[PDB]
Design brief:
The protein is α+β, with helices and mostly antiparallel strands. It has one domain (1-85): Histidine-containing Protein, Chain: A (2-Layer Sandwich). The chain has 3 helices and 4 strands. A 4-stranded antiparallel beta sheet has the order 1-4-2-3, covered by helices on one side. A hairpin with a 3-residue loop joins strand 2 (35-38) and strand 3. Residues 2-85 form the HPr domain.
């Protein structure tokens, strides 16, 4: 059913890497295509660390999370708890 949400960072959308990178390494756990973007117009497909570096400038912005696959919720929901920190 796809899942997508806009997580307002407090100053760390996991952008850093470890957590945002877990999506990917964890994606191997959740079958889902989690998409990370900033309402700013910055778009990052959970897997393009380069793209994640983009939202790094986040710090206050808001991210739009979108996952799609069997476990897109657990995945997007796992980041969220992370995006939500």
């Amino acid at each position: 059913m796809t899942v997508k949400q806009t997580v307002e960072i407090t100053n760390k959308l996991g952008m850093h890497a470890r957590p945002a990178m877990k999506l990917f390494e964890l994606m191997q756990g959740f079958d889902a295509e989690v998409l990370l973007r900033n309402d700013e117009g910055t778009e990052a497909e959970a897997n393009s660390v380069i793209a994640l570096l983009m939202l790094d400038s986040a710090k206050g912005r808001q991210i739009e999370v979108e996952a799609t696959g069997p476990q897109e919720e657990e995945a997007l929901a796992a980041v969220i708890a992370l995006f939500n920190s």
